[PDB]
Amino acid sequence: QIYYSDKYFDEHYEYRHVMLPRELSKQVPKTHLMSEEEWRRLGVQQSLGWVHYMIHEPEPHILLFRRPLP
Amino acid sequence: MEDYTKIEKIGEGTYGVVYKGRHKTTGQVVAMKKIRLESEEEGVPSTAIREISLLKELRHPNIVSLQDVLMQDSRLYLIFEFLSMDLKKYLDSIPPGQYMDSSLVKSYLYQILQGIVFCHSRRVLHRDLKPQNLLIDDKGTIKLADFGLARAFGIPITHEVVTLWYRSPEVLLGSARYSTPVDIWSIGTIFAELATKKPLFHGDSEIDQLFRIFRALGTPNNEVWPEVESLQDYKNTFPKWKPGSLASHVKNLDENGLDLLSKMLIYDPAKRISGKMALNHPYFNDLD
Ligand SMILES: CCc1cnn2c(NCc3ccc[n+](O)c3)cc(N3CCCC[C@H]3CCO)nc12
């Protein structure tokens, strides 16, 4: 099933990423960044305020999320 | 080949299964590495077996000698000298709270560099150096295995997370070309792991590996690594860490050790130290 990395941090944001299994990633129609509604359809569960901010094209099944610090 | 008897299986590596074996004539205990060749298109030979011929001639104390190559149709055994242990397994076997004696670290790094310098001077790269690929005998000698095979087999195109930890940023960011500096990077990461017993950059994926590197070395940009902002997979939304931070990931290493390590881990492949230069580094002045 779905994997969740540990959180890591910038001076400005906190970040995590999430690894979709090959069945679930294969389904997604969207080739580009997603809204919170879209990534909630998929089963990703995080608190509110997490933003899908980039795609590493070599690994499209990895979803990279950021969220600003206080 | 009828000239060998397979004793037992010793593990699975990048190229497949490796057996302990015995040469029937001589009682020479050997390592036999089975590589599944594809059936090939009529009129279209691979240049694998010719690249293999070249490697078969290389002899150096710090590389594992390829003693023989046995062909079948669609199959190939590579025969090597046998060795008691691999470096992965040896580091696992050190009890928690013990480290490796810092003079054996030094000795091992030195020998590792001798092997690589010997290969680099013949335009042979390894490209996937890792503790599993470094083999020790009980007398203090360490040897490189699988040198040259990536060029020999390997294509322009899994679960090898382990393999990602020693990978260079030029490769991970999708640069068109790589060269000898990828092996010095690997050697960098392995040096840290000799000292600390654990991986320096313990990534779960390519992106995470990149992030683990940026965290320790700082997120690069054109100032530190010229033209990096043009590489295909550079994004200017990466997290922004500042030049590290690297000494904090590494214990059991002095001023000189840290100096050599940071030169092995320079971002710009064109400026990263070379194998020859690393062997002249003062970290090794108190070796022999
Ligand atoms: C070049 C072939 C060779 C020669 N010795 N050797 C060893 N010797 C150490 C050892 C390991 C376990 C049990 N015993 O008894 C001995 C290991 C090894 N490998 C370790 C991991 C599986 C593939 C492979 C890595 C790529 O060489 N490959 C080789």
CA nearest B115: which of B96, B90, B141?
B141
> Closest Cα to atom 21, ligand 1: which residue?
B11
Is the CB–ligand 1 distance for residue B111 below 6 Å? no
Rounded to the nearest angstrom, the distance between the alpha carbon of B286 and the centre of ligand 1 is 31
> Closest Cα to atom 6, ligand 1: which residue?
B83
Token pair 């971002």 in the structure block, residue: B267
Taking the CA of residue B129 and the nearest CA in chain A, the distance in Å comes to 22
What is the DSSP secondary structure assignment for residue A13, as one 8-state letter?
A: E
Here the tokens at position B211 are: 């992030």
Contact between B136 and B85 (Cβ < 8 Å) = yes
- The three-state DSSP-derived secondary structure of chain B is CCCEEEEEEEEEECCEEEEEEEECCCCCEEEEEEEECCCCCCCCCCCHHHHHHHHHHCCCCCECCEEEEEEECCEEEEEEECCCEEHHHHHHCCCCCCCCCHHHHHHHHHHHHHHHHHHHCCCCCCCCCCHHHEEECCCCCEEECCCCHHHHCCCCCCCCHHHHCCCCHHHHCCCCCCCCHHHHHHHHHHHHHHHHCCCCCCCCCHHHHHHHHHHHHCCCCCCCCCCHHHCCCCCCCCCCCCCCCCHHHCCCCCHHHHHHHHHHCCCCHHHCCCHHHHHCCHHHCCCC
d(CA B7, CA B16): 17
Domain segments of chain B as ranges: 1-84, 85-288
- Which CATH number does A1-70 carry? 3.30.170.10
Domain segments of chain A as ranges: 1-70
Residues of A with CB under 8 A from a CB of B: 3, 5, 8, 10-13, 15, 17, 19, 53-54, 56-59, 62, 64
What is the DSSP secondary structure assignment for residue A3, as one 8-state letter?
A: E
Structure determination technique employed: X-ray
Token pair 């010719």 in the structure block, residue: B50
B128 is catalytic: yes
Decide which of 3.30.200.20, 3.10.20.740, 3.40.50.2000, 3.30.70.2740 is the CATH code for B1-84: 3.30.200.20
Residue B44 marked in a binding site: no
Decide which of 3.40.50.720, 3.40.50.2300, 1.10.510.10, 2.60.40.1180 is the CATH code for B85-288: 1.10.510.10
Inter-CA distances, B268 with B170, B181, B224, Å? 8, 9, 8
Token pair 């260079």 in the structure block, residue: B168
